[model samples]
Target: RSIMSSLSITLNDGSKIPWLGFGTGTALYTKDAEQDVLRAIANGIVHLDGAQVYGNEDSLGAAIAASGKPRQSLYVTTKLAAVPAGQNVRDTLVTSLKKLKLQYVDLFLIHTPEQHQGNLKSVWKQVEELQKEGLAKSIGVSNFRVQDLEEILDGASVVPAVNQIEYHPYVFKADQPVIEYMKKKNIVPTSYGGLTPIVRFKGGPVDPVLASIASRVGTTAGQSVSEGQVLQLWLRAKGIPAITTSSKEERIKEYLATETLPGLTPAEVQAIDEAGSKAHHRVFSKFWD
Candidate 1:
């Protein structure tokens, strides 16, 4: 309960989003995103992030049904209108709700900026209507850059509550311009692949700095700490929320501990930024670019 209470970002629509979330990807969990959803809920995680393209919402619905947690207490997020053609935002979320077995999701997002079958502004208008109808409590987008957001805002009745993107130290500067722009617009930035500093860029410049920070915290707390944990804390300290996943029970618990992780001082945070700016490596696709 303490971890769940650590911090949350207030959305533009007056909803609160937990700072840490469990993300479900298509291939990473190998048909186990459903099973891990159950584990995540049991382990005090209040947020569950999913996408319609993941092809596992049905299974996720099963886990939610069995968890016995009250629906009002959970923050369930899902993406919609992923098809490249003839995608209806309303219908997509309707299918998602049926698959999720829920009356309404806490949040909904456009899976990408690729406005295939419809105009970007049109789709966004439809998304706003969904929120008005209460099918989605909050509306936002994924893989959207500043320009895409601008197009929506050109004629939008509602501003986005969040922008979900792949973010981490190794590629921090890559999207710094847009992230800074989002901050100015009151659009909260939510990170996926936030553990890349350790997962993909091991022994990179940020590793040693993070190791030093983790070591100090570990000794003070009398427990071993990992560089990944430090990386997570850096994001939280900066008011950035992150979504990550793990199949292992221990790994899930490791993420939960991030709620109580010691804060990084200004100098330590700068050290990470300095180290991260050394390279512009990007692990995800360039579709958003």
Candidate 2:
């Protein structure tokens, strides 16, 4: 077992979240996620990131129940979608809990700012109530940009614990401001599409840098380390939690293997930052722009 798998990041709310999580939105989006979620759990992925927008909470819930792992042993996060005209945040989370087969989720987030546009503060207040009621241990926002965060934080008593976003070297430049703002507010930035530079937009400046660093880390560990793992480490170096997913068992293990690899040198991380800054690529969401 990898010791890194147990690594966690403490949120401002005083909650500890696993640094790495298996997301149910990408490959499992809108599909029955039972088998893939089951595989992730069996392979020792204790953090599961899900969302109501993914439209597969039933399967995610089923997988958790079927895994037979104690509820306390895992971390589950589900994002809130746009509530129905008459519905409230608590109602939405109650439905999610029923589908997640849990009494409370480790974290709950407002899925996107676009959905709550004019009522951001009101929605956030409701999210806070969920945390207060213990329906969600920590409440946060996702895909929120600087202005969105400001609007919600205006009179909020319980600041958002996190802001889940598409974070990779490619989008680093554009996301830097929001990231910095989040830091100041003690809102941890959790990354979702963290591997986009390699997986989605290749031939970028950071490619060669990642490859070289992967090789060096692999040599030190005496095993083949992947560029993907290097990217995960990059996020770790920045103190961000990563949420990623894959249907392949080998890929899942490869991501977890990142924990045992040596940390990237400051210079190596700087190289990635410089390379990533050379080009501005946004893989997900234009709300920030």
Candidate 3:
């Protein structure tokens, strides 16, 4: 209970974000996510990550209303999708707020930089205004590369508080430069698709290493630690917030149980890194490719 309550990363904007968040994309994309979100909240998830592209903000709002949990006790995030031609960032977020049934979101992000390629700097300026207007407590970007970050940081007043990326052992090598840059800029890295090695691309070299670490940690803790738990711990080792989702109560509980598990040894982390470097996989947003 203490671990779950305390596991958070302090962003550049001085807001503490829960380290583990329940994502509303993936399986719930464009689907009514009210029931699954309700289950997640019931099972102890406090961070809810939603997106305009997901087409489920109304459902997330409904779930939040039905959960009976105080708004202050929860962290809600939503991404801005493709903006209409004549609209601005504030206009987009206003519409998103109406859909989410909240005056402001905990965090708002540019879903991807692809849409605003040439005018990213101007777009970021507008996003910064959202924070000033109290439309979002914090602002960040997702699926952003170093080049994109560089473009936005030029003459910008507020550095992005976080950068949500498709992070896992498989992309560690490829993501090193941007990760290193973010560290220099004091931008936290939040992860999605953290379990790809096990879920999407199984039978890789990292598979055996994950199994071994899970066994060792489980034996020591006197409770079964799953490979999924190991993956989440790996993110914690790097100090990255992890965003994942599941429709199953048991799976949601399993994810929360990760907070109680031990941290990975330095060698264990390196083993997974080296093993993953042997193979390459990019599940979403192939802009880097």
Q: Highest lDDT among the candidates is held by which one?
A: 3
Candidate 1, residues 208-254: lDDT per residue as tens digits? Answer: 99999999878877788898888888888888887887767798898
Candidate 2, position 22, lDDT: 90
Q: Which pairs clash in model 3?
A: none
lDDT of 3 by residue, 129-193 (tens): 99999999999999999999999999999999999999999998899999999999999999999
**Lowest summed-lDDT stretch of 10 residues in model 1?**
1-10
Q: How well does each candidate superpose onto the true structure, as a TM-score?
A: 0.94, 0.96, 0.96
Candidate 1 root-mean-square deviation in Å: 2.0
Better of 1 and 3 by lDDT: 3
In model 2, where do residues sit more than 4 Å from their true spots?
Answer: 1-5, 26-32
- Clashes found in each candidate (C-alpha, N, C closer than 3 A): 0, 0, 0
Candidate 2 matches the true fold with a TM-score of 0.96
In model 3, which range of ten residues has the least summed lDDT? Answer: 1-10
For candidate 3, give the lDDT of residue 37: 88
Predicted structure 2: clash tally: 0
